[PDB]
Amino acid sequence: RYRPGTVALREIRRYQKSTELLIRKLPFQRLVREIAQDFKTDLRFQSSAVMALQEASEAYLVGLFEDTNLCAIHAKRVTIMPKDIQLARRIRGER
Amino acid sequence: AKAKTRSSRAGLQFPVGRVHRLLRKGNYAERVGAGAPVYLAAVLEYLTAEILELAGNAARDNKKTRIIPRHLQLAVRNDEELNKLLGRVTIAQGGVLPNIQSVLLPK
Amino acid sequence: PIVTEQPSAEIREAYIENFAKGEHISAIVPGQSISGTLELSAQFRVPRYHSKNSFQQALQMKAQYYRGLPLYEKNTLLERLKQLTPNEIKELEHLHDAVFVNTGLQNVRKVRTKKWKKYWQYKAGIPIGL
Amino acid sequence: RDTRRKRRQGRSLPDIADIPRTFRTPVPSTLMPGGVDVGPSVESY
Amino acid sequence: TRKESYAIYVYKVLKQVHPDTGISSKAMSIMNSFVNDVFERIAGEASRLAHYNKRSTITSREIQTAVRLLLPGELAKHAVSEGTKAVTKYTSA
Amino acid sequence: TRKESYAIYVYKVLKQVHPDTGISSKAMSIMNSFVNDVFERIAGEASRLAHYNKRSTITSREIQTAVRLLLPGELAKHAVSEGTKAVTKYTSA
Amino acid sequence: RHRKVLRDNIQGITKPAIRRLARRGGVKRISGLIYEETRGVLKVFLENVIRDAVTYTEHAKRKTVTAMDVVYALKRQGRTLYGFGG
Amino acid sequence: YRNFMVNSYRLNPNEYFSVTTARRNVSGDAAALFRLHKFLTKWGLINYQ
DNA sequence: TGGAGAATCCCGGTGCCGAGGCCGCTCAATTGGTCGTAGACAGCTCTAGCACCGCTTAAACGCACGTACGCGCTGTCCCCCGCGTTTT
DNA sequence: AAACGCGGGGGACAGCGCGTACGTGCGTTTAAGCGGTGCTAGAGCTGTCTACGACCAATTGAGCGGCCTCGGCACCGGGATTCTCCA
């Protein structure tokens, strides 16, 4: 068959050619009930508060993966490693 | 009548009617519920004690009875929750905690 | 199906090989036991022989075995419950609950002894039931 | 930081609300319930 | 020209807390800045809550809500209690 | 309940500016989410300035300073124009 | 009499979802060290909002969740987002 | 206590019957159980094989 | 440097629900009078920023140089993904 | 979809080379900064002052919620195109 590595970038085209989220949604709503029910239960769960955070999550994560490869290619790797991620989050101030 | 300051009613040093006066001054609400200034002056004196604690700690750790902003740096920035809460607050004449990067240390 | 240990004979050894170093592992390991849960209060409850207001209205007006109790006849028990007072209804509820919990503990105790007698034979090299 | 405030209002003890549980690391014992079955076996091989 | 500051009050909590350590006026000024700093932080947060629910009576319940929100960890729960503490000393008095 | 909605006025600006193009109500909700948010950003900044001048007045000079300090480049300077100019139109009408 | 409480759908958020988003975030060879190194860090994002946002709910005397307090918390964190009124 | 320790060793004599399992399975102070276990293993009778 | 094929972009037919306007009906936004007062703005003063040089002198700078590390170059192995899978 | 695998080949990684750089030392000033002036400037303090939108009375149409479309753009069928991987 093929080698390790090749078909990444058109994904990096297509995902960023497109506008949507890249995540399972019944795990998303169940994760929202999961995390908001952990603090105070008995919440009647409007889907507004459910979907209102996914842009705040996934896009920032996407921005983090660019910083990840920024530290990876600054350290000259594309097999990205969490040393790159946490050095980024350090210089992001997360870590 | 007289200025018989409202901190003595609360066991405080921060006059809670100066605090109620400031809350009426700060446009926070129309009615300033008269425990909101006591909540304020009480959290105030709690944090004053919080920081004067570590301040005298670091000052006498530097064998000085005078608390200086360098001592304020070395006491506050050593804390997790304080410096986590005050990551963007700078202390003039506070300087640095003494620490070197590990691999820049010679071998 | 009579024990509840970790039945893999290579994760128990790797657990102790890292436990002497002082390290956790990936999989979990419990102590050995038998199976079975003694689940009370998700079972027979204290019954509700009183109504929703049969005590405060009584306060105003100033008032063979199935599980552990034998089934009474229709006519003999009816005059018996035409005798009693709501000062003794709270006694009767707890008496019948004390019978129910005792039977539900007796049978589970018998099953538990039947399980432990096969646990001790299995852990001593005897196959079963000898 | 709880004790940091016991001194301020004390200027002017066991916690009975935290009741701990009893989990135990299992002893390496063959026969006894509650212990892992590492070591020498029941059969003598 | 007696102008109300917090220098003798930070002195009061100093000799309440570290009487063994006197202060520099620089640290005193840092704290006098800090007093009005968080006095504005929490109370602007409280006015933010007073506009979240459109309220015009900010009570200590609302400062409790602000202390609940803004402060990390024990800094909340202590200022929950301590901010109630003298409240219970003043609602008594 | 007359709730001050910002679909029609922003849409008046759209029929002024990009009138060939409509606007999705998701995008129109982005605009409606933009409106009072921006209306209070510089407003809180400006009341802070009103106490930096320690004033109980606020004039368009204060909004001018809110434009002056903050906005990047000609986004300031056109709003130095525009913020004054329609003021200059309102002082003309 | 049924208690609906969920926990860790962040694995129901799949590792193929990471093979999606890492490409959306510009990663080529996502090493195996990465996929769950992600799934913890975002969860640090997850509770911290609602830890404050549930804090909005009870002073508001409520037993529901609105996106209004989501916006209160996000703008309170400096995570301003449009599409929701303001 | 003595019959418990001796009966519990003789089910599997290849295993060292430790003090900690005897302490965890009968109720008593650790000093007296440790002294009784060390006396018992001093005279053979337990952990002899 | 080239075709086979797999992915993409583009183009034709469908239809729809959302974008936008329509129809009251206020209600808020305005105009219309204060209203002292806020800051408008005059005076006063005095100070507090002002350069400036005398001069030092150690800091900065002037340079010899020495080698350390950062990259030059390699092989690898590994390792992670791609193709195929299905189920979930 | 997930999910489970699975060649598979090159990407990480080690590691060795190499050579230079960047400190280091020390010679060389040198401008740093200090004092020390002389002064004056706008800050600062007062000194009145009025206008200004406050505020509230009246009003009124604004503008937007509820009520009318029908059409921009999505969806899909089919084909053209266009990038990529093994010749």
mmCIF file of N, CA, C and O in Angstrom, chain G:
data_model
loop_
_atom_site.group_PDB
_atom_site.id
_atom_site.type_symbol
_atom_site.label_atom_id
_atom_site.label_comp_id
_atom_site.label_asym_id
_atom_site.label_seq_id
_atom_site.Cartn_x
_atom_site.Cartn_y
_atom_site.Cartn_z
ATOM 1 N N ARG G 1 -37.485 8.664 37.956
ATOM 2 C CA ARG G 1 -36.582 8.067 38.935
ATOM 3 C C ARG G 1 -35.281 7.623 38.276
ATOM 4 O O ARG G 1 -34.568 6.771 38.806
ATOM 5 N N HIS G 2 -34.980 8.206 37.117
ATOM 6 C CA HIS G 2 -33.771 7.886 36.366
ATOM 7 C C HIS G 2 -32.800 9.058 36.435
ATOM 8 O O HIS G 2 -33.159 10.190 36.089
ATOM 9 N N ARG G 3 -31.573 8.783 36.870
ATOM 10 C CA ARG G 3 -30.541 9.803 37.040
ATOM 11 C C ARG G 3 -29.669 9.847 35.788
ATOM 12 O O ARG G 3 -28.850 8.954 35.559
ATOM 13 N N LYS G 4 -29.843 10.887 34.973
ATOM 14 C CA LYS G 4 -29.037 11.074 33.770
ATOM 15 C C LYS G 4 -27.806 11.914 34.097
ATOM 16 O O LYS G 4 -27.882 13.148 34.136
ATOM 17 N N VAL G 5 -26.677 11.245 34.330
ATOM 18 C CA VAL G 5 -25.385 11.885 34.568
ATOM 19 C C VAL G 5 -24.375 11.248 33.627
ATOM 20 O O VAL G 5 -24.195 10.024 33.637
ATOM 21 N N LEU G 6 -23.720 12.068 32.814
ATOM 22 C CA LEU G 6 -22.757 11.588 31.833
ATOM 23 C C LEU G 6 -21.340 11.892 32.303
ATOM 24 O O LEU G 6 -21.137 12.719 33.197
ATOM 25 N N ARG G 7 -20.364 11.188 31.730
ATOM 26 C CA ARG G 7 -18.974 11.358 32.131
ATOM 27 C C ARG G 7 -18.055 10.911 31.006
ATOM 28 O O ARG G 7 -18.208 9.804 30.480
ATOM 29 N N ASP G 8 -17.093 11.779 30.678
ATOM 30 C CA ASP G 8 -16.043 11.553 29.681
ATOM 31 C C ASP G 8 -16.603 11.110 28.335
ATOM 32 O O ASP G 8 -16.481 9.954 27.925
ATOM 33 N N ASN G 9 -17.240 12.036 27.653
ATOM 34 C CA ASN G 9 -17.512 11.828 26.248
ATOM 35 C C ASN G 9 -16.364 12.310 25.384
ATOM 36 O O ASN G 9 -16.484 12.316 24.158
ATOM 37 N N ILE G 10 -15.251 12.707 26.011
ATOM 38 C CA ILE G 10 -14.070 13.194 25.319
ATOM 39 C C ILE G 10 -13.309 12.074 24.635
ATOM 40 O O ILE G 10 -12.378 12.341 23.868
ATOM 41 N N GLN G 11 -13.668 10.828 24.918
ATOM 42 C CA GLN G 11 -13.277 9.702 24.091
ATOM 43 C C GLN G 11 -14.351 9.308 23.092
ATOM 44 O O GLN G 11 -14.018 8.788 22.022
ATOM 45 N N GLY G 12 -15.626 9.553 23.405
ATOM 46 C CA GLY G 12 -16.621 9.608 22.352
ATOM 47 C C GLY G 12 -16.363 10.713 21.359
ATOM 48 O O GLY G 12 -16.760 10.592 20.194
ATOM 49 N N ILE G 13 -15.706 11.780 21.802
ATOM 50 C CA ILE G 13 -14.919 12.624 20.923
ATOM 51 C C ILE G 13 -13.741 11.772 20.488
ATOM 52 O O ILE G 13 -12.869 11.448 21.294
ATOM 53 N N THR G 14 -13.711 11.376 19.227
ATOM 54 C CA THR G 14 -12.838 10.271 18.879
ATOM 55 C C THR G 14 -11.392 10.718 18.678
ATOM 56 O O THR G 14 -11.064 11.902 18.670
ATOM 57 N N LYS G 15 -10.511 9.730 18.607
ATOM 58 C CA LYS G 15 -9.169 9.991 18.100
ATOM 59 C C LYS G 15 -9.162 10.269 16.595
ATOM 60 O O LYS G 15 -8.327 11.080 16.158
ATOM 61 N N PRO G 16 -10.033 9.666 15.759
ATOM 62 C CA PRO G 16 -10.284 10.262 14.435
ATOM 63 C C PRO G 16 -10.725 11.714 14.453
ATOM 64 O O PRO G 16 -10.427 12.425 13.491
ATOM 65 N N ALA G 17 -11.411 12.188 15.501
ATOM 66 C CA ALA G 17 -11.696 13.616 15.599
ATOM 67 C C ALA G 17 -10.417 14.426 15.760
ATOM 68 O O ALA G 17 -10.338 15.562 15.287
ATOM 69 N N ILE G 18 -9.402 13.849 16.396
ATOM 70 C CA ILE G 18 -8.095 14.492 16.481
ATOM 71 C C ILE G 18 -7.365 14.400 15.160
ATOM 72 O O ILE G 18 -6.672 15.335 14.757
ATOM 73 N N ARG G 19 -7.529 13.288 14.449
ATOM 74 C CA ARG G 19 -6.964 13.190 13.111
ATOM 75 C C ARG G 19 -7.685 14.107 12.134
ATOM 76 O O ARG G 19 -7.199 14.333 11.025
ATOM 77 N N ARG G 20 -8.865 14.585 12.510
ATOM 78 C CA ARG G 20 -9.494 15.696 11.813
ATOM 79 C C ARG G 20 -8.892 17.034 12.244
ATOM 80 O O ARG G 20 -8.337 17.773 11.427
ATOM 81 N N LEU G 21 -8.983 17.355 13.534
ATOM 82 C CA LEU G 21 -8.684 18.702 14.009
ATOM 83 C C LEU G 21 -7.199 19.040 13.977
ATOM 84 O O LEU G 21 -6.850 20.214 13.822
ATOM 85 N N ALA G 22 -6.322 18.046 14.131
ATOM 86 C CA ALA G 22 -4.891 18.266 13.995
ATOM 87 C C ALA G 22 -4.535 18.664 12.577
ATOM 88 O O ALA G 22 -3.633 19.484 12.367
ATOM 89 N N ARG G 23 -5.246 18.111 11.599
ATOM 90 C CA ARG G 23 -5.137 18.619 10.241
ATOM 91 C C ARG G 23 -5.763 19.994 10.130
ATOM 92 O O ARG G 23 -5.225 20.865 9.449
ATOM 93 N N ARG G 24 -6.900 20.213 10.789
ATOM 94 C CA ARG G 24 -7.431 21.568 10.825
ATOM 95 C C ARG G 24 -6.506 22.489 11.609
ATOM 96 O O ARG G 24 -6.397 23.675 11.286
ATOM 97 N N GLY G 25 -5.771 21.951 12.574
ATOM 98 C CA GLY G 25 -4.752 22.737 13.224
ATOM 99 C C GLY G 25 -3.365 22.637 12.630
ATOM 100 O O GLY G 25 -2.413 23.190 13.188
ATOM 101 N N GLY G 26 -3.228 21.961 11.498
ATOM 102 C CA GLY G 26 -1.937 21.932 10.842
ATOM 103 C C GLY G 26 -0.930 21.002 11.472
ATOM 104 O O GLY G 26 0.145 21.442 11.888
ATOM 105 N N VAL G 27 -1.257 19.735 11.582
ATOM 106 C CA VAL G 27 -0.313 18.724 12.034
ATOM 107 C C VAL G 27 -0.208 17.666 10.944
ATOM 108 O O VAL G 27 -1.218 17.307 10.331
ATOM 109 N N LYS G 28 1.013 17.212 10.646
ATOM 110 C CA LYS G 28 1.139 16.145 9.660
ATOM 111 C C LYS G 28 1.226 14.764 10.289
ATOM 112 O O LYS G 28 0.307 13.953 10.148
ATOM 113 N N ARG G 29 2.308 14.489 11.009
ATOM 114 C CA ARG G 29 2.454 13.192 11.663
ATOM 115 C C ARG G 29 2.081 13.409 13.123
ATOM 116 O O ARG G 29 2.919 13.759 13.957
ATOM 117 N N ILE G 30 0.797 13.231 13.431
ATOM 118 C CA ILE G 30 0.338 13.254 14.819
ATOM 119 C C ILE G 30 0.875 11.992 15.470
ATOM 120 O O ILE G 30 0.343 10.900 15.253
ATOM 121 N N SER G 31 1.897 12.145 16.300
ATOM 122 C CA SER G 31 2.417 10.999 17.017
ATOM 123 C C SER G 31 1.379 10.489 18.009
ATOM 124 O O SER G 31 0.431 11.188 18.372
ATOM 125 N N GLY G 32 1.555 9.234 18.427
ATOM 126 C CA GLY G 32 0.661 8.642 19.407
ATOM 127 C C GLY G 32 0.690 9.338 20.750
ATOM 128 O O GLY G 32 -0.275 9.242 21.515
ATOM 129 N N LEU G 33 1.763 10.082 21.029
ATOM 130 C CA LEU G 33 1.902 10.850 22.258
ATOM 131 C C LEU G 33 0.967 12.049 22.307
ATOM 132 O O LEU G 33 0.851 12.684 23.358
ATOM 133 N N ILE G 34 0.292 12.364 21.209
ATOM 134 C CA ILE G 34 -0.406 13.630 21.082
ATOM 135 C C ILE G 34 -1.879 13.491 21.422
ATOM 136 O O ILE G 34 -2.428 14.331 22.143
ATOM 137 N N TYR G 35 -2.499 12.405 20.931
ATOM 138 C CA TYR G 35 -3.956 12.288 20.852
ATOM 139 C C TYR G 35 -4.644 12.399 22.202
ATOM 140 O O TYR G 35 -5.676 13.062 22.308
ATOM 141 N N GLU G 36 -4.058 11.863 23.254
ATOM 142 C CA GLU G 36 -4.659 12.063 24.556
ATOM 143 C C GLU G 36 -4.011 13.189 25.336
ATOM 144 O O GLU G 36 -4.638 13.708 26.266
ATOM 145 N N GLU G 37 -2.792 13.596 24.950
ATOM 146 C CA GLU G 37 -2.209 14.842 25.444
ATOM 147 C C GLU G 37 -3.112 16.027 25.126
ATOM 148 O O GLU G 37 -3.165 17.004 25.879
ATOM 149 N N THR G 38 -3.818 15.953 23.999
ATOM 150 C CA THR G 38 -4.895 16.887 23.715
ATOM 151 C C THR G 38 -6.012 16.777 24.748
ATOM 152 O O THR G 38 -6.385 17.772 25.383
ATOM 153 N N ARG G 39 -6.530 15.557 24.950
ATOM 154 C CA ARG G 39 -7.857 15.372 25.536
ATOM 155 C C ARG G 39 -7.915 15.771 27.007
ATOM 156 O O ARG G 39 -9.008 15.996 27.541
ATOM 157 N N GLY G 40 -6.767 15.872 27.674
ATOM 158 C CA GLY G 40 -6.762 16.422 29.018
ATOM 159 C C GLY G 40 -6.804 17.938 29.034
ATOM 160 O O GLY G 40 -7.565 18.535 29.802
ATOM 161 N N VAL G 41 -6.008 18.572 28.162
ATOM 162 C CA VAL G 41 -5.750 20.010 28.229
ATOM 163 C C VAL G 41 -7.022 20.804 27.967
ATOM 164 O O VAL G 41 -7.350 21.745 28.703
ATOM 165 N N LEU G 42 -7.782 20.395 26.945
ATOM 166 C CA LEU G 42 -9.062 21.027 26.645
ATOM 167 C C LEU G 42 -10.053 20.848 27.784
ATOM 168 O O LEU G 42 -10.912 21.711 28.009
ATOM 169 N N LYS G 43 -9.938 19.742 28.531
ATOM 170 C CA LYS G 43 -10.819 19.553 29.671
ATOM 171 C C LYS G 43 -10.509 20.552 30.772
ATOM 172 O O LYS G 43 -11.401 20.897 31.550
ATOM 173 N N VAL G 44 -9.264 21.038 30.827
ATOM 174 C CA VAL G 44 -8.921 22.174 31.680
ATOM 175 C C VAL G 44 -9.715 23.403 31.264
ATOM 176 O O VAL G 44 -10.164 24.193 32.102
ATOM 177 N N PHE G 45 -9.900 23.571 29.956
ATOM 178 C CA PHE G 45 -10.798 24.589 29.430
ATOM 179 C C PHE G 45 -12.238 24.340 29.854
ATOM 180 O O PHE G 45 -13.004 25.290 30.038
ATOM 181 N N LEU G 46 -12.608 23.079 30.063
ATOM 182 C CA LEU G 46 -14.022 22.725 30.055
ATOM 183 C C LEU G 46 -14.716 23.077 31.361
ATOM 184 O O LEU G 46 -15.771 23.721 31.350
ATOM 185 N N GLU G 47 -14.151 22.664 32.490
ATOM 186 C CA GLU G 47 -14.826 22.857 33.768
ATOM 187 C C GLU G 47 -14.776 24.310 34.204
ATOM 188 O O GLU G 47 -15.752 24.826 34.768
ATOM 189 N N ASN G 48 -13.653 24.979 33.926
ATOM 190 C CA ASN G 48 -13.352 26.307 34.450
ATOM 191 C C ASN G 48 -14.374 27.347 34.036
ATOM 192 O O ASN G 48 -14.651 28.271 34.807
ATOM 193 N N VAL G 49 -14.947 27.204 32.844
ATOM 194 C CA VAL G 49 -16.045 28.070 32.440
ATOM 195 C C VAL G 49 -17.264 27.785 33.298
ATOM 196 O O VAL G 49 -17.812 28.680 33.955
ATOM 197 N N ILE G 50 -17.671 26.517 33.340
ATOM 198 C CA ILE G 50 -18.929 26.167 33.971
ATOM 199 C C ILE G 50 -18.830 26.271 35.475
ATOM 200 O O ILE G 50 -19.843 26.518 36.135
ATOM 201 N N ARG G 51 -17.614 26.138 36.018
ATOM 202 C CA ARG G 51 -17.362 26.419 37.426
ATOM 203 C C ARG G 51 -17.775 27.837 37.778
ATOM 204 O O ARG G 51 -18.331 28.089 38.852
ATOM 205 N N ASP G 52 -17.530 28.774 36.874
ATOM 206 C CA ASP G 52 -18.091 30.096 37.074
ATOM 207 C C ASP G 52 -19.537 30.168 36.616
ATOM 208 O O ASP G 52 -20.336 30.874 37.240
ATOM 209 N N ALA G 53 -19.895 29.422 35.567
ATOM 210 C CA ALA G 53 -21.179 29.653 34.912
ATOM 211 C C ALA G 53 -22.336 29.116 35.734
ATOM 212 O O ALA G 53 -23.388 29.764 35.821
ATOM 213 N N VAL G 54 -22.143 27.955 36.356
ATOM 214 C CA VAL G 54 -23.067 27.469 37.368
ATOM 215 C C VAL G 54 -23.144 28.454 38.526
ATOM 216 O O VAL G 54 -24.219 28.677 39.096
ATOM 217 N N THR G 55 -22.020 29.118 38.828
ATOM 218 C CA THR G 55 -21.990 30.196 39.810
ATOM 219 C C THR G 55 -22.911 31.349 39.430
ATOM 220 O O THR G 55 -23.464 32.016 40.313
ATOM 221 N N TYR G 56 -23.114 31.578 38.130
ATOM 222 C CA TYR G 56 -24.110 32.557 37.708
ATOM 223 C C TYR G 56 -25.524 32.076 38.018
ATOM 224 O O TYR G 56 -26.395 32.881 38.373
ATOM 225 N N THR G 57 -25.756 30.763 37.916
ATOM 226 C CA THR G 57 -27.101 30.191 37.909
ATOM 227 C C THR G 57 -27.806 30.325 39.249
ATOM 228 O O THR G 57 -29.003 30.630 39.296
ATOM 229 N N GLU G 58 -27.087 30.106 40.341
ATOM 230 C CA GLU G 58 -27.748 30.000 41.632
ATOM 231 C C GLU G 58 -28.022 31.364 42.241
ATOM 232 O O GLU G 58 -29.031 31.540 42.930
ATOM 233 N N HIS G 59 -27.126 32.329 42.029
ATOM 234 C CA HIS G 59 -27.447 33.690 42.433
ATOM 235 C C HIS G 59 -28.597 34.231 41.599
ATOM 236 O O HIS G 59 -29.404 35.027 42.092
ATOM 237 N N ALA G 60 -28.723 33.753 40.360
ATOM 238 C CA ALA G 60 -29.904 33.971 39.535
ATOM 239 C C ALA G 60 -31.091 33.123 39.952
ATOM 240 O O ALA G 60 -32.156 33.290 39.340
ATOM 241 N N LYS G 61 -30.927 32.233 40.943
ATOM 242 C CA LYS G 61 -32.005 31.405 41.502
ATOM 243 C C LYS G 61 -32.639 30.508 40.439
ATOM 244 O O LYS G 61 -33.860 30.483 40.274
ATOM 245 N N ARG G 62 -31.807 29.771 39.707
ATOM 246 C CA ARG G 62 -32.288 28.946 38.612
ATOM 247 C C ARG G 62 -31.805 27.506 38.700
ATOM 248 O O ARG G 62 -30.835 27.183 39.387
ATOM 249 N N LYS G 63 -32.509 26.651 37.960
ATOM 250 C CA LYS G 63 -32.147 25.255 37.769
ATOM 251 C C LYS G 63 -32.134 24.895 36.292
ATOM 252 O O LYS G 63 -32.585 23.813 35.920
ATOM 253 N N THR G 64 -31.723 25.817 35.433
ATOM 254 C CA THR G 64 -31.503 25.553 34.024
ATOM 255 C C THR G 64 -30.161 26.159 33.632
ATOM 256 O O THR G 64 -29.557 26.914 34.396
ATOM 257 N N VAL G 65 -29.669 25.809 32.447
ATOM 258 C CA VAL G 65 -28.484 26.441 31.880
ATOM 259 C C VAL G 65 -28.885 27.196 30.618
ATOM 260 O O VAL G 65 -29.531 26.628 29.730
ATOM 261 N N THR G 66 -28.517 28.473 30.550
ATOM 262 C CA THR G 66 -28.652 29.282 29.347
ATOM 263 C C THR G 66 -27.287 29.543 28.728
ATOM 264 O O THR G 66 -26.253 29.490 29.396
ATOM 265 N N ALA G 67 -27.291 29.866 27.438
ATOM 266 C CA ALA G 67 -26.057 30.352 26.841
ATOM 267 C C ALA G 67 -25.779 31.799 27.213
ATOM 268 O O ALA G 67 -24.702 32.302 26.888
ATOM 269 N N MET G 68 -26.739 32.476 27.851
ATOM 270 C CA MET G 68 -26.513 33.823 28.366
ATOM 271 C C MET G 68 -25.380 33.843 29.374
ATOM 272 O O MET G 68 -24.482 34.685 29.297
ATOM 273 N N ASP G 69 -25.388 32.906 30.305
ATOM 274 C CA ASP G 69 -24.310 32.862 31.273
ATOM 275 C C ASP G 69 -23.054 32.239 30.689
ATOM 276 O O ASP G 69 -21.956 32.500 31.194
ATOM 277 N N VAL G 70 -23.189 31.453 29.614
ATOM 278 C CA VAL G 70 -22.024 31.052 28.830
ATOM 279 C C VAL G 70 -21.331 32.283 28.263
ATOM 280 O O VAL G 70 -20.105 32.411 28.337
ATOM 281 N N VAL G 71 -22.111 33.223 27.732
ATOM 282 C CA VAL G 71 -21.550 34.459 27.196
ATOM 283 C C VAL G 71 -20.997 35.329 28.321
ATOM 284 O O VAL G 71 -19.932 35.945 28.173
ATOM 285 N N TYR G 72 -21.699 35.362 29.465
ATOM 286 C CA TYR G 72 -21.219 36.052 30.663
ATOM 287 C C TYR G 72 -19.845 35.548 31.076
ATOM 288 O O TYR G 72 -18.949 36.332 31.407
ATOM 289 N N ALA G 73 -19.663 34.232 31.032
ATOM 290 C CA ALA G 73 -18.408 33.633 31.457
ATOM 291 C C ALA G 73 -17.323 33.795 30.403
ATOM 292 O O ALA G 73 -16.169 34.070 30.739
ATOM 293 N N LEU G 74 -17.666 33.609 29.127
ATOM 294 C CA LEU G 74 -16.666 33.702 28.067
ATOM 295 C C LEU G 74 -16.151 35.121 27.920
ATOM 296 O O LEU G 74 -14.937 35.345 27.868
ATOM 297 N N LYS G 75 -17.062 36.094 27.860
ATOM 298 C CA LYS G 75 -16.664 37.493 27.908
ATOM 299 C C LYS G 75 -15.986 37.818 29.230
ATOM 300 O O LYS G 75 -15.048 38.621 29.277
ATOM 301 N N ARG G 76 -16.425 37.167 30.310
ATOM 302 C CA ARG G 76 -15.743 37.279 31.586
ATOM 303 C C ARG G 76 -14.346 36.681 31.533
ATOM 304 O O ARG G 76 -13.470 37.117 32.282
ATOM 305 N N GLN G 77 -14.110 35.716 30.652
ATOM 306 C CA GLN G 77 -12.767 35.199 30.433
ATOM 307 C C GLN G 77 -12.048 35.866 29.277
ATOM 308 O O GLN G 77 -10.888 35.534 29.018
ATOM 309 N N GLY G 78 -12.701 36.779 28.569
ATOM 310 C CA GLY G 78 -12.086 37.355 27.394
ATOM 311 C C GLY G 78 -12.124 36.387 26.236
ATOM 312 O O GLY G 78 -11.132 36.193 25.530
ATOM 313 N N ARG G 79 -13.280 35.767 26.043
ATOM 314 C CA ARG G 79 -13.538 34.833 24.957
ATOM 315 C C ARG G 79 -14.756 35.291 24.181
ATOM 316 O O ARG G 79 -15.735 34.558 24.011
ATOM 317 N N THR G 80 -14.714 36.557 23.761
ATOM 318 C CA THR G 80 -15.839 37.214 23.107
ATOM 319 C C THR G 80 -16.196 36.538 21.791
ATOM 320 O O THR G 80 -15.335 36.297 20.941
ATOM 321 N N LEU G 81 -17.472 36.214 21.645
ATOM 322 C CA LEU G 81 -17.987 35.529 20.473
ATOM 323 C C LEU G 81 -19.317 36.157 20.098
ATOM 324 O O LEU G 81 -20.112 36.517 20.970
ATOM 325 N N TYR G 82 -19.549 36.301 18.804
ATOM 326 C CA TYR G 82 -20.780 36.888 18.313
ATOM 327 C C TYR G 82 -21.702 35.815 17.758
ATOM 328 O O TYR G 82 -21.325 34.653 17.607
ATOM 329 N N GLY G 83 -22.913 36.242 17.429
ATOM 330 C CA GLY G 83 -23.974 35.362 17.001
ATOM 331 C C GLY G 83 -25.040 35.124 18.036
ATOM 332 O O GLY G 83 -25.920 34.287 17.814
ATOM 333 N N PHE G 84 -24.995 35.844 19.165
ATOM 334 C CA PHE G 84 -25.760 35.448 20.340
ATOM 335 C C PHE G 84 -26.439 36.609 21.056
ATOM 336 O O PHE G 84 -27.008 36.400 22.134
ATOM 337 N N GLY G 85 -26.396 37.813 20.516
ATOM 338 C CA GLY G 85 -27.048 38.932 21.169
ATOM 339 C C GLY G 85 -26.074 39.751 21.994
ATOM 340 O O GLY G 85 -25.159 39.226 22.635
ATOM 341 N N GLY G 86 -26.256 41.066 21.956
ATOM 342 C CA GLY G 86 -25.322 41.977 22.589
ATOM 343 C C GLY G 86 -25.197 43.267 21.813
ATOM 344 O O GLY G 86 -24.114 43.709 21.428
#
